[PDB]
Amino acid sequence: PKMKTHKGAKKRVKITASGKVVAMKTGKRHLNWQKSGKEIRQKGRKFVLAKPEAERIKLLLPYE
Amino acid sequence: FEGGRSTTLMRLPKRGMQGQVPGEIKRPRYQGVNLKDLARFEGEVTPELLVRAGLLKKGYRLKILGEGEAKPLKVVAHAFSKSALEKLKAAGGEPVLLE
Amino acid sequence: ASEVRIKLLLECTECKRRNYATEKNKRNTPNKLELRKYCPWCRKHTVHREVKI
RNA sequence: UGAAAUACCACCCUGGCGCGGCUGGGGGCCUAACCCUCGGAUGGGGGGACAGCGCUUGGCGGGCAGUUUGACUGGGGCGGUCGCCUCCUAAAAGGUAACGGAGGCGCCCAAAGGUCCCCUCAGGCGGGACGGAAAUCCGCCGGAGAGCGCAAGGGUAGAAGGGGGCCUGACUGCGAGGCCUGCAAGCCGAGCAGGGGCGAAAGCCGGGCCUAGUGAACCGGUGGUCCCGUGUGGAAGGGCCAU
RNA sequence: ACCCGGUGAAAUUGAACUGGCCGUGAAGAUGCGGCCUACCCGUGGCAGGACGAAAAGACCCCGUGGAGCUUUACUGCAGCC
RNA sequence: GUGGAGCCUGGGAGUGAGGGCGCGAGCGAUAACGUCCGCGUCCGAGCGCGGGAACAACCGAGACCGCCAGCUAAGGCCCCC
RNA sequence: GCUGGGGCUAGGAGUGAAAAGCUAACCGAGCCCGGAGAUAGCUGGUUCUCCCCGAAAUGACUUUAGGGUCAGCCUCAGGCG
RNA sequence: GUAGGGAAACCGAGUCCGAACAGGGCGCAGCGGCCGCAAAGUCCGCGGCCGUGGACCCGAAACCGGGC
RNA sequence: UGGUUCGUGGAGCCAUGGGGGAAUCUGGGCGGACCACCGCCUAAGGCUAAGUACUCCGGGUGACCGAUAGCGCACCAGUAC
RNA sequence: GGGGGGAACCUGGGGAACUGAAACAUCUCAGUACCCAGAGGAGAGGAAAGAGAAAUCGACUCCCUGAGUAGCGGCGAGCGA
Numbered sequence: 001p002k003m004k005t006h007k008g009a010k011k012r013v014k015i016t017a018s019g020k021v022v023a024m025k026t027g028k029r030h031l032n033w034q035k036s037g038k039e040i041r042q043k044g045r046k047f048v049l050a051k052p053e054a055e056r057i058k059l060l061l062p063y064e
Numbered sequence: 065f066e067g068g069r070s071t072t073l074m075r076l077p078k079r080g081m082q083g084q085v086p087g088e089i090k091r092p093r094y095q096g097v098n099l100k101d102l103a104r105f106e107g108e109v110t111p112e113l114l115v116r117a118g119l120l121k122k123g124y125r126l127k128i129l130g131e132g133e134a135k136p137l138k139v140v141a142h143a144f145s146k147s148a149l150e151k152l153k154a155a156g157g158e159p160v161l162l163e
Numbered sequence: 164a165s166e167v168r169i170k171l172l173l174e175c176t177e178c179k180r181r182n183y184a185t186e187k188n189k190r191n192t193p194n195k196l197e198l199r200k201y202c203p204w205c206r207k208h209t210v211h212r213e214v215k216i
Numbered sequence: 217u218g219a220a221a222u223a224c225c226a227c228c229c230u231g232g233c234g235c236g237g238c239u240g241g242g243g244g245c246c247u248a249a250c251c252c253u254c255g256g257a258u259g260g261g262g263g264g265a266c267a268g269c270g271c272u273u274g275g276c277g278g279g280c281a282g283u284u285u286g287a288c289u290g291g292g293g294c295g296g297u298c299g300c301c302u303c304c305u306a307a308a309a310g311g312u313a314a315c316g317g318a319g320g321c322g323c324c325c326a327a328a329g330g331u332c333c334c335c336u337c338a339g340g341c342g343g344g345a346c347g348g349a350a351a352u353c354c355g356c357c358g359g360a361g362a363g364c365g366c367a368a369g370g371g372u373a374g375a376a377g378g379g380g381g382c383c384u385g386a387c388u389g390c391g392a393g394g395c396c397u398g399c400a401a402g403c404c405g406a407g408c409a410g411g412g413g414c415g416a417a418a419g420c421c422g423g424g425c426c427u428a429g430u431g432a433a434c435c436g437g438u439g440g441u442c443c444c445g446u447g448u449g450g451a452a453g454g455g456c457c458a459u
Numbered sequence: 460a461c462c463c464g465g466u467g468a469a470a471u472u473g474a475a476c477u478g479g480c481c482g483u484g485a486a487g488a489u490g491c492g493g494c495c496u497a498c499c500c501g502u503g504g505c506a507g508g509a510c511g512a513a514a515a516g517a518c519c520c521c522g523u524g525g526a527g528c529u530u531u532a533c534u535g536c537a538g539c540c
Numbered sequence: 541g542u543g544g545a546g547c548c549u550g551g552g553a554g555u556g557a558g559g560g561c562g563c564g565a566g567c568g569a570u571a572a573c574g575u576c577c578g579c580g581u582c583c584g585a586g587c588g589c590g591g592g593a594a595c596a597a598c599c600g601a602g603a604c605c606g607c608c609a610g611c612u613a614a615g616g617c618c619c620c621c
Numbered sequence: 622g623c624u625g626g627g628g629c630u631a632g633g634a635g636u637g638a639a640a641a642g643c644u645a646a647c648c649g650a651g652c653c654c655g656g657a658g659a660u661a662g663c664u665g666g667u668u669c670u671c672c673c674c675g676a677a678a679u680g681a682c683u684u685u686a687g688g689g690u691c692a693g694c695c696u697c698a699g700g701c702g
Numbered sequence: 703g704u705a706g707g708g709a710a711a712c713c714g715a716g717u718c719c720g721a722a723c724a725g726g727g728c729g730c731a732g733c734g735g736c737c738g739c740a741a742a743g744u745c746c747g748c749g750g751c752c753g754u755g756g757a758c759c760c761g762a763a764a765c766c767g768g769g770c
Numbered sequence: 771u772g773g774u775u776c777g778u779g780g781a782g783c784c785a786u787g788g789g790g791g792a793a794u795c796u797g798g799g800c801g802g803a804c805c806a807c808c809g810c811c812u813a814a815g816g817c818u819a820a821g822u823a824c825u826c827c828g829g830g831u832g833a834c835c836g837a838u839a840g841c842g843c844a845c846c847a848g849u850a851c
Numbered sequence: 852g853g854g855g856g857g858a859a860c861c862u863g864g865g866g867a868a869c870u871g872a873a874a875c876a877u878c879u880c881a882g883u884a885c886c887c888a889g890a891g892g893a894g895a896g897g898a899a900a901g902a903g904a905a906a907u908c909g910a911c912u913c914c915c916u917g918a919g920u921a922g923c924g925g926c927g928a929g930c931g932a
C-alpha cells in the first residue's frame with residue numbers, strides 16, 4: 001500500500017524549496033553552563049544536512 | 065537503519081509545536097496570487113474566478129501579492145500585501161478588501 | 164563542576180531575568196557573586212547577582 | 217515599685233470540662249441478613265453482623281509466566297580492556313595496526329579572568345646574628361637548565377613567568393573565511409552593531425600559554441517570552457529563549 | 460563358507476582406460492614431475508589405502524537461534540495477608 | 541601531457557574473511573606457509589601462455605579470431621628435449 | 622506377588638518405590654490440524670547468447686566483529702573541456 | 703503544480719534571528735522570425751532501483767490456539 | 771476498565787464492574803480538563819426495505835491450465851493405502 | 852413454537868503466539884488465527900440526548916476522496932481517524 005510518512009523526520013527536519021534538508025544544530029539541550037556564548041549562539045541556527053543523509057531523509061517524507 | 069548505532073535522524077533534535085489531541089485548530093487560510101497571474105483577466109477578478117482558472121485553490125482565502133505589474137482591475141480579495149496595494153492603486157486598479 | 168564548585172545563574176538585578184550561567188567554588192567564594200553584565204532586555208550594563216541554578 | 221493596674225465590659229492566646237453538631241475508634245450483648253447443622257424445614261439448635269462473596273488499597277509472592285544475562289580476544293572461559301589527553305612505534309607532509317613501549321584525565325581558578333604599568337629566573341662561588349644542604353640579607357657570575365595549578369609534548373623572559381592599580385569582554389546580537397572530517401561533531405576566526413573594562417594613545421578584551429577535565433537524541437524540571445489556545449473570552453496544555 | 464540347479468536383494472555410485480617410490484601440490488597423490496615396475500580377464504581369501512560407507516560433529520566455538528532448569532536477575536501473574 | 545584522463549550532477553552496484561612476495565618497522569626467539577601496520581607488486585579476478593623437473597602469486601609476458609610464416613623475452617643449446 | 626475382563630486420571634497436564642522415567646516403536650514438555658509461506662544477519666541453490674567496461678577484502682561508527690550505514694574503489698546517462 | 707520564509711501569530715519576492723536602514727540562513731530570476739518551436743509542471747506507457755507485503759526459492763530447532 | 775487516532779496525557783466523548791445517587795423542560799446531555807457566554811441536541815423502550823458482503827448452486831466469458839499442468843480427484847477419490 | 856444442518860459471508864461472547872521493534876517488557880502482530888453462541892438470504896446499522904464552527908448540516912449502510920492528513924507513539928518500530 002502507500003508509503004507512510006516517517007513522523008520522527010517530519011518533527012525534526014524541513015525540506016526547503018530547492019530540495020535541501022535543514023535541521024537544528026545538536027548540542028545545546030543541556031550541559032550548557034560552561035559553553036561560550038559563541039557556542040550557544042551558533043548552535044541556535046539551522047544547518048544543511050550532508051547530501052548522503054539528506055537523500056535518505058527525503059525518501060521518508062514522500063508527501064511533503 | 066544504520067547497523068545498530070543511533071541513527072542520523074534520531075540524533076537531530078525535535079523543534080516546534082507538534083500539536084496534540086483533539087488536533088488541528090481550525091483557522092482561516094490564505095493562498096497568495098501575484099499580480100502577474102492576473103494579467104489574463106479583464107474587468108473584475110474574484111476568488112470564484114481564480115479558483116476556476118486553476119490559480120487559487122478551494123477552501124483558501126485570497127491574498128494578492130506583488131510580484132509583477134498591476135493592471136487596472138477591480139480585484140476583490142480577502143487581503144493585500146503592501147506592495148500589491150501600492151502597485152494596484154498606482155495603476156487604475158480597484159482593491160476591494162472583504163470578508 | 165563538583166559538589167564544592169557549583170553551577171549558577173546571574174540574574175539582572177533590574178528586570179530580574181537570568182542572563183548568564185557560570186560557576187564558582189562556594190567554599191572559596193561563599194558570598195553571592197555580583198558582576199556587572201550586559202542585560203539584553205535592559206540593553207545596558209547592569210548589576211547581576213547569583214541565583215540558584 | 218511595676219515594661220504590663222487592678223472595678224466592671226470586651227475581642228481573643230495556651231490549656232480544662234459541660235452541653236450540642238458532624239464525625240472516628242475500641243468493648244459488651246442481641247438476632248434477623250449471611251454461613252453450618254437438625255429423621256421434623258414459614259420451624260428448632262450453633263456461629264453471627266463476624267466469616268464468605270463483590271469493587272477498591274497497599275504488601276508478601278520462582279508456585280507459575282515472559283525475558284534479559286555486551287563486545288574485543290593469536291579458540292572460548294578466566295584475566296585484562298572499552299571514552300578523552302601526551303610521547304614513541306610512524307618509514308623527515310597528513311594519516312597509519314597489534315591483548316606493542318610509557319604516562320595522565322572525568323578537575324580546577326572570582327583570580328589562576330580583562331587591561332594598563334612595573335619587575336626577571338634556576339643554580340654556582342664569596343660575604344652575613346640566631347640560621348642549618350635549604351628561611352631572610354649583600355656582591356659577582358649565570359640565555360634560561362627556573363617558572364607557567366596537575367601527565368606529557370610543543371612553546372615561552374623582546375613573557376606565556378612575578379608584583380600592583382582599576383576592573384567583569386568568564387559580553388549581547390551576528391560572522392567573511394578557513395582547519396579537520398563518512399555522518400554527526402570538534403576547532404580557529406578577522407570584521408560590523410549594541411552597551412562596556414583598561415589605556416594618554418596606538419590599541420587590547422567574546423575567559424584561562426596551548427593540546428585532557430567529556431555525553432547526541434528522547435522524557436521531564438525551573439526562570440523568562442506572551443507565539444498557539446479545539447464555537448467565543450479566559451484557562452488547562454503546548455511552543456520559543458535560557459538553564 | 461565352496462561347487463552345481465532354482466529364486467534373487469542392499470547401502471553405495473561425478474565419470475574412470477583406477478600401479479610403486481622419491482618429490483611436488485591447499486601442508487598425507489592411482490590422476491602433477493621424475494624415475495621404477497607392469498601381457499588381457501577372473502575365482503577363493505586378508506583388510507594397509509581409496510583422508511573407504513553410514514549420520515549437513517554430539518566435543519569446541521559462533522548466531523543480539525531455541526529449549527529445560529535455578530535464584531536475594533528484571534518484570535508480571537496465581538495464591539495468600 | 542587528449543588519456544577507457546580529469547571535474548560536476550544523477551541511476552545501478554558489488555566489496556567491507558584477503559593472500560604471497562620485496563623493502564621499512566612493531567610483536568615473536570635477529571622462530572613459523574606466524575602475527576600487526578606502512579610503501580609497492582602480483583595472485584585474487586591472468587589456476588590462460590613461456591621459464592623455474594612438477595607448483596596461485598619467483599623470472600618472462602597482459603591470450604579478439606585464423607596461418608604447416610618470421611623476430612625475440614626469461615630460460616636454454618651432450619641425450620631424454 | 623503375577624495376570625484376564627470392566628473402568629478413571631493427559632500435555633505445563635497426568636502418572637511416577639524418582640530414571641526428568643512413562644503418557645501408542647525418538648518425551649527436559651505427546652500427536653494432529655491450524656496461526657503458517659513463523660522467523661533463519663546462517664548453509665545450499667538460482668536456468669539462453671554475444672559485445673564494452675570492471676572492482677573490494679580499507680576508514681569511521683555499530684550488543685558490532687563471518688551482519689550493517691556512510692565514505693573509498695566499479696559502472697551507466699547527462700554536463701563541463 | 704502555480705511562493706516562500708517562520709515553532710507560530712504572521713508577513714510575503716521575500717522572510718526568519720536581531721534593537722538594526724548590521725550580517726547571515728532559507729527563498730526569488732527561453733532561443734529563432736506577435737506567428738513558430740521549445741520549457742515550468744503534469745498525465746499516461748516503458749525500464750532500473752527503493753518502501754509495504756511470504757517479496758528470489760527450499761530448510762529449522764521452536765512459540766501459540768483448538769482438538770485427538 | 772474498554773472503545774476512539776488518543777499508550778494517563780491538558781483527557782473530554784461513547785460504553786460500564788463497584789460505591790454514592792437526581793430532576794420532568796425553569797428538566798437534562800454535548801461542543802476535548804474547567805468556568806462564563808453563545809449555540810447544537812433531547813438518554814435511560816422497540817422496529818424498519820434499499821444501496822453493502824459471500825459463492826455450496828446455475829449460466830456466460832478468458833493475451834487461464836492442458837494429465838508432473840489445472841481442484842487432492844479429467845479415470846469408481848476424500849478412494850486405495 | 853424450539854432443537855439439527857448449511858461453502859463462504861455476518862453479528863455478538865471470548866481471544867493467542869510466532870513475528871516486528873535487527874535483544875526485550877510498554878508497543879507490534881491483532882481484536883487477526885481460533886473457540887463459542889446466534890442470524891439469515893444476507894447480517895450488522897439506522898430516524899440525533901448526532902456532527903462541529905459553517906449564523907451550517909440533517910437516519911443508517913456502502914464506494915471514491917478528504918489522507919498516510921489530523922493526531923497517536925519505549926514520540927521507537929510503527930499505528931492511524
Ligand SMILES: *C(=O)[C@H](CCSC)NC=O
Nearest residue numbers: 291292516517518519520
Ligand atoms: C573429549 O573427550 C571428547 C568428548 C566427546 S563427548 C563429551 N571427544 C571427542 O571430541
Ligand SMILES: [Mg+2]
Nearest residue numbers: 001002004754
Ligand atoms: Mg497498512
Ligand SMILES: [Mg+2]
Nearest residue numbers: 007008011926
Ligand atoms: Mg518522533
Ligand SMILES: [Mg+2]
Nearest residue numbers: 012013014080
Ligand atoms: Mg521545521
Ligand SMILES: [Mg+2]
Nearest residue numbers: 028029030458
Ligand atoms: Mg532547551
Ligand SMILES: [Mg+2]
Nearest residue numbers: 030031032033
Ligand atoms: Mg549542566
Ligand SMILES: [Mg+2]
Nearest residue numbers: 034035036423
Ligand atoms: Mg572553558
Ligand SMILES: [Mg+2]
Nearest residue numbers: 036037038422
Ligand atoms: Mg562566552
Ligand SMILES: [Mg+2]
Nearest residue numbers: 036038039040
Ligand atoms: Mg565554540
Ligand SMILES: [Mg+2]
Nearest residue numbers: 040041044457
Ligand atoms: Mg540568542
Ligand SMILES: [Mg+2]
Nearest residue numbers: 058059061062
Ligand atoms: Mg521523496
Ligand SMILES: [Mg+2]
Nearest residue numbers: 059060061062
Ligand atoms: Mg519518498
Ligand SMILES: [Mg+2]
Nearest residue numbers: 063064918920
Ligand atoms: Mg498531499
Ligand SMILES: [Mg+2]
Nearest residue numbers: 068069070684
Ligand atoms: Mg549501541
Ligand SMILES: [Mg+2]
Nearest residue numbers: 010081082083
Ligand atoms: Mg504537524
Ligand SMILES: [Mg+2]
Nearest residue numbers: 033034035184
Ligand atoms: Mg555561559
